[PDB]
């Protein structure tokens, strides 16, 4: 019971946290949105793209 | 020569003139836009 008890709780702890973070992580995503990326940029749409 | 006449030249020979007389000085206008083409993107990024 207790230790079922103990686990359970810092379970609920790290929900918390991880969720923020993985929020957080699609956020950042959103802020900023990369060109220079070498796989994004084909560049005059399809010819170029692989 | 009358005033009138005269009137006619100013504006269909001077005034053209004194405009196509103030020069671009390109190179150092295309300094100019290629400066400003970075200023409106920097901070973001290429196309378009």
């Known amino acids: 019971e207790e230790t079922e008890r103990i686990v359970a709780n810092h379970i609920r702890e790290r929900e918390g946290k991880t969720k923020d973070q993985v929020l957080l992580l699609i956020d950042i995503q959103v802020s900023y ?3 220079n990326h070498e796989d ?8 170029q793209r692989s | 020569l009358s005033g009138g006449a005269s009137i006619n030249r100013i ?5 053209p003139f004194e405009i ?4 671009f000085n ?3 206008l295309r300094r100019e836009i290629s400066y400003a083409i970075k200023n409106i993107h920097g ?3 290429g196309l378009f």
């Open chain 1, 33 to 35: 949105i990369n060109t």
């Open chain 1, 40 to 47: 994004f940029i084909g560049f005059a749409n399809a010819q």
């Open chain 2, 11 to 15: 504006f269909h020979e001077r005034f």
């Open chain 2, 20 to 23: 196509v007389k103030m020069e």
């Open chain 2, 26 to 28: 390109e190179k150092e």
């Open chain 2, 43 to 45: 901070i973001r990024t």
